[PDB]
Design a binder for these strands. Structure first.
Ligand SMILES: [Mg+2]
Ligand SMILES: [Mg+2]
Lengths: 82, 76, 75, 80
DNA sequence: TTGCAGTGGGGTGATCT
DNA sequence: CATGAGATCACCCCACTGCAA
DNA sequence: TTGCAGTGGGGTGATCT
DNA sequence: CATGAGATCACCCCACTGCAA
């Protein structure tokens, strides 16, 4: 590659670099405000951060409840002379 | 007010902007791989995307399960 | 035993290699010190140059001491 | 370079390597025992080491002497 | 009402891998 | 990161030399 | 009088640069 | 070590948009 060639190649490289990021921001955008909405990059990332924590918290609550529900039906089976 | 004076000023505005995004990718990073690691931006995003989807399905599945378990409780 | 003889001599050859290598390490400690990392030939190149350097420095000093003593005597 | 070529090359590189050391051990030999004498590698280096130390010690001795001679000459006039 | 901050696209150079 | 290659080192094997039993 | 350690040459793979 | 080259990042400059004064 000559200087101009490196440049031109690098620009195509950098184009691929940008999509590697911008394409994932769109993916995150669709996950947090949906495919139809329009939202700016930092806002999408801000929503993605809080959505993840929300989902993480929910997951914990959902699990705590699943165990309780399971412990409940299990106990329902116990007929033992009390 | 010179063009260059104006380019320089906006340059400071653009760094603000760039950091509005970068600071946030670092936040996502700390959530997916933690603080000690080093992971490029696109990989932080890829992980965050997959983590969200993973949690989304994990949560939906627990919800489905919890429904039955709850109804089982009823039908008992 | 061709082999056993080899193994045994191999130990002899290591002792030998070490007889040269440990000296290069000493020469190295002398010319660039202990913390440095320097390859064998540079250690030797330096040693050679260092000796030549001190040789000339000491000659010059001896001829000058000569002249100084002559002066003192011739006074 | 194929393994075969790399091999052949390496042997010539290693020939150059050895010479870069051996050629110097003989430069040292000549300094410690002379052009004509023959002494083995480790004894040449042992001699080089001790010779350097001696050259170092001598230089210090010589400098001190040089100063004393110089301080001598001075007084040899500086007598007020 | 419109001129700047904000926002984003694309290019470059330095540096990394 | 990859390839490419010369450099550096330890160690291999071989040859031989000379001294200590 | 001679085998065995010592010495040195060159090759080679592993690794560094 | 030396290319070589893609990837990564920050910053550049440019264009445009929307809102605060
Ligand atoms: Mg960016
Ligand atoms: Mg050697």
């Amino acid at each position: 590659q000559s200087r101009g060639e490196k440049r031109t190649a690098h620009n195509a490289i950098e184009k691929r670099y940008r999509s590697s990021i911008n394409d994932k921001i769109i993916e995150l955008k669709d996950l947090v405000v949906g495919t139809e909405a329009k939202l700016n990059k930092s806002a999408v990332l801000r929503k993605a951060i809080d959505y993840i924590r929300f989902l993480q918290h929910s997951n914990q609550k959902l699990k705590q409840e699943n165990l309780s529900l399971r412990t409940a039906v299990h106990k329902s089976k116990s007929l033992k002379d009390l």
